[PDB]
Design an enzyme around this catalytic site. Structure first.
Site, PDB file in Angstrom:
ATOM      1  N   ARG A  78       0.868  -1.209   0.000  1.00  0.00           N
ATOM      2  CA  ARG A  78       0.000   0.000   0.000  1.00  0.00           C
ATOM      3  C   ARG A  78       0.896   1.248   0.000  1.00  0.00           C
ATOM      4  NH1 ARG A  78      -2.856  -0.283   3.961  1.00  0.00           N
ATOM      5  NH2 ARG A  78      -1.310   0.502   5.456  1.00  0.00           N
ATOM      6  N   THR A  79       1.858   1.319   0.933  1.00  0.00           N
ATOM      7  CA  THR A  79       2.651   2.553   1.194  1.00  0.00           C
ATOM      8  C   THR A  79       3.536   2.804  -0.023  1.00  0.00           C
ATOM      9  OG1 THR A  79       2.453   2.358   3.563  1.00  0.00           O
ATOM     10  CG2 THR A  79       4.227   3.730   2.816  1.00  0.00           C
ATOM     11  N   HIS A 133       6.825   7.185  11.108  1.00  0.00           N
ATOM     12  CA  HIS A 133       6.101   7.124   9.812  1.00  0.00           C
ATOM     13  C   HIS A 133       5.431   8.469   9.558  1.00  0.00           C
ATOM     14  CE1 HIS A 133       3.924   4.469   6.641  1.00  0.00           C
ATOM     15  NE2 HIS A 133       4.550   5.529   6.127  1.00  0.00           N
ATOM     16  N   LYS A 153      24.067  -6.884   0.305  1.00  0.00           N
ATOM     17  CA  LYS A 153      24.688  -8.242   0.250  1.00  0.00           C
ATOM     18  C   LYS A 153      26.059  -8.172   0.950  1.00  0.00           C
ATOM     19  CE  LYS A 153      24.006 -12.559  -0.492  1.00  0.00           C
ATOM     20  NZ  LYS A 153      24.210 -13.427  -1.668  1.00  0.00           N
ATOM     21  N   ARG A 193      11.898   2.527   3.042  1.00  0.00           N
ATOM     22  CA  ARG A 193      11.253   1.726   4.118  1.00  0.00           C
ATOM     23  C   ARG A 193      12.149   0.554   4.467  1.00  0.00           C
ATOM     24  NH1 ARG A 193       5.371   1.416   5.842  1.00  0.00           N
ATOM     25  NH2 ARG A 193       5.373  -0.007   7.617  1.00  0.00           N
TER      26      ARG A 193
HETATM   27  C1  LIG Z   1      -2.367  -0.803  -2.765  1.00  0.00           C
HETATM   28  C2  LIG Z   1      -3.420  -0.574  -1.877  1.00  0.00           C
HETATM   29  C3  LIG Z   1      -3.843  -1.538  -0.989  1.00  0.00           C
HETATM   30  C4  LIG Z   1      -3.173  -2.761  -1.004  1.00  0.00           C
HETATM   31  N1  LIG Z   1      -3.363  -3.897  -0.252  1.00  0.00           N
HETATM   32  C5  LIG Z   1      -2.455  -4.846  -0.630  1.00  0.00           C
HETATM   33  C6  LIG Z   1      -1.666  -4.357  -1.624  1.00  0.00           C
HETATM   34  C7  LIG Z   1      -2.100  -3.017  -1.889  1.00  0.00           C
HETATM   35  C8  LIG Z   1      -1.703  -2.004  -2.779  1.00  0.00           C
END
Ligand SMILES: c1ccc2[nH]ccc2c1
Ligand SMILES: c1ccc2[nH]ccc2c1
Lengths: 328, 346, 334
Positions: free
Chosen positions: A71-72, A149, A100, A121
């Protein structure tokens, strides 16, 4: 450049933010917050009205994500790409298969010579700090194990300030009460928002079963910042072990993830909330918020997620511009 | 705007109709939409071949969610988006479960649709693509799922066929196209969706397979229905063969399928079927002079390398047309408006 | 229009020659092409350092096929492409076998070349880059293979060296440059290809290695051939050493390699006190123990500037190869 009451020398504030790294929400001051909130609302209105969003072409970024937060990550990628800039992704990697057995210092020393800024991240506490030391280029923290965050704080605040814009006024008679609900010990998204909200006239209700209650030093940080703007009372910080008591007379209900019930939000548990109340959640949810609630005009958790795009666009613009600003 | 020279195309009108359409099943594309895709694909073919400006869609941002590795299909779409002058963010090397980290699909597409202008989506789950389409506030384009739905592969298969035999659009009772489908027709789901589409026109099918892997009853029923609808069904519409020399006779198109070892009970059974439908310059001497050979790829032993020299082979041009067809489809769907001028022309 | 201080460059002529060139071995770059890459890299260095417009190649789409993780090298190219204002589609975290899922290589490059304008390709397989170059309808740039071909690393190694010692181009019998290669010269394939290139000029090599890991015999033969071709070969062209104190003496460049055991050749401020005043230290990186951290403070250390120049050299190379823009004007000039 106004947000109803407050003028914003967006020129002055950008000269100050130019090439700023943002690691902790504490890196953003009063003027900077106003600039982010003003600029985010420009980008919100521009995108919603299908107008040109390309306010930052000419930049190339690196999106280094050493844990999967899809998501982020995708939010930032969208932010960069909607601004009309380009991005180079490192992903599906972890701390050790990326570095590595190369030193972190060496890697950010080199990578900073390739790109104009880095979104980073990493679960590692120590690493984001080491990058910030070694990078010749701004770093924007997309999260670490220190529960820093800033983008999530900034977008949580942007959401709250859109329904209750008196939060900026710091007026002793216009006070906002918020209920934090669930795992406040480990919901690090709570600790960061708290740090920020306490800078304003705010009243907190920590709603938890004992074992997962808000940590002592957050409450100390809140109390410090309330005391600094003369908004601390016996009634600043209250605690509850159930919703019926906790959700009473609160402008914002911020639900957290609760792993390992009394803290499931239903249309039942929402009957005795204020008429104006808005429900937030950083997501993903699981059982924390029952689906029936999505119909409820009180639910805003999906608009919150959406504002993430407009807030990260704002922040990238204010930091990386080599300034004409977005308006109307 | 003109295709074949017979059919005029109000590309303005047809775009207003397709704007923000999701394309999940080939059944989502109608007659006017097919003509629009075929016209627009040929514009992009000629523009790219002549090294001219291809940026017909610059201000868009996509998400390419590929929850199974299909590097050919993915890269095609990436190229399509990038050649149009739009940008894309990819999710890849991921599977169903490590992408939806116990997040509901509904929630994930609800949020992700707020970030981007459209989503290209490949998932083995059939359930999931449908759930995304329900939850997304933005058009979705299916790049493939477990139900063998792959409209872009249909569309590009058709575009290839119509480039050598453009009378397929005419639906004229005297201008009929015969095709041979060859190999694993049970599991070659690229066959089922092309068949669905071809049967909308005057077409005669030869299903060439060995008992265990013959075309499923479903497809035959669907084909029969659609031939009966345009009065092109006869007892010679659908023919079956268990060998090439009979099946490849008097056919305009030979569409070879993949024959994966992984679908037999052993590797005896395997090479018996692999080797009996292997296409050679030998097996191609009894085909029409105009015949064109299609294959969705990857090939393996299905088609011997010697055949690539053969003017009959077009499987690589087919793969290439994928670029031009996905550009067409993205243009027609995601354009903010049409103007007469702003459409691609040559 | 276009000089390297003293040498003119018909960058129009040289581009019409390089247009749609694949670059697989450093041997695929000749004299005029090297001057063009060195000129164009220094334009891009100056343009980027002065925050001016770098978009000298919009309109192109590339594929970055990386079938082993070299994240430094990959990211370099991606940045090169993106800063030029072109776009890229990446294939990565893949290996030889899970990418070509029993597809022939020939078939895969035949198809993918129809999607993009050029391909950047890293594969451990010797065989494979050559197979791609045969099958692709589009220029390929090798980002490295198991045959130790890495032309971009050579080109950027050279660009770094020419920035501190620009007399290397002059091939002047009185202005000779001496270099020390230090560590695992058997397996440091970055040494073999730079040597091949440097020997085209008036250069003196010091191979500093134990027994098991000395420079291989055919590199010495290749160096000797190319020195003999420009009449710069002597008994003292190629020297060998067992230790730094002897090897690092009177050398313009110290190029340190990785020495992966799977002690004696570690660079310190101590071991650098007997080097020339003007000496510059190179390393392709990552380092590990090869160069002690204290050395980074030393004005002699340039390994990080080297890594940085990778961006300007790959921009140069992509520009020179993929541009369709004629006009003498449209080239970078600052
Ligand atoms: C964008 C928004 C929500 C999400 N949930 C899992 C992947 C993902 C990407
Ligand atoms: C870019 C720059 C430096 C690096 N070190 C390890 C990976 C990597 C990528």
């Amino acid at each position: 450049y106004i947000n109803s009451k407050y003028k914003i020398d967006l020129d002055k504030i950008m000269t100050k933010m130019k090439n700023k790294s943002v690691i902790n929400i504490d890196d953003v001051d009063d003027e900077e917050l106003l600039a982010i909130l003003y600029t985010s609302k420009q980008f919100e209105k521009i995108l919603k009205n299908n107008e040109d969003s390309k306010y930052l072409e000419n930049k190339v970024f690196c999106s280094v994500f050493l844990e999967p937060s899809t998501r982020t990550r995708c939010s930032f990628d969208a932010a960069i790409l909607k601004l009309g800039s380009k991005v180079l992704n490192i992903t599906d990697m972890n701390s050790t298969s990326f570095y590595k057995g190369e030193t972190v210092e060496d890697a950010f020393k080199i990578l900073s010579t390739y790109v104009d800024g880095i979104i980073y991240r990493d679960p590692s506490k120590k690493n984001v700090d080491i990058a910030v030391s070694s990078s010749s280029k701004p770093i924007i923290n997309a999260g670490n194990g220190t529960g820093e965050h800033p983008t999530q704080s900034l977008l949580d605040f942007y959401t709250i300030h859109n329904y209750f814009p008196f939060i900026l006024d710091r007026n002793i008679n216009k006070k906002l009460n918020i209920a934090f609900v669930g795992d406040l010990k480990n919901g690090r998204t709570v600790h960061s928002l708290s740090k920020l909200l306490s800078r304003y006239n705010v009243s907190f209700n920590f709603v938890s079963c004992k074992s997962l209650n808000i940590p002592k030093d957050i409450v100390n940080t809140i109390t410090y910042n309330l005391k600094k703007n003369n908004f601390y009372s016996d009634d600043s910080i209250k605690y509850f072990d159930n919703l019926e008591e906790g959700l009473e007379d609160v402008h914002i209900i911020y639900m957290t993830r609760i792993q390992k019930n009394a803290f499931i939000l239903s249309n039942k548990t929402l009957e005795n909330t204020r008429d104006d109340t808005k429900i937030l959640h950083p997501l993903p949810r699981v059982n924390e918020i029952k689906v029936e609630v999505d119909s409820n005009p009180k639910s805003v958790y999906f608009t919150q997620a959406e504002n993430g795009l407009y807030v990260r666009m704002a922040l990238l613009y204010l930091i990386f511009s080599s300034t004409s600003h977005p308006q109307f």
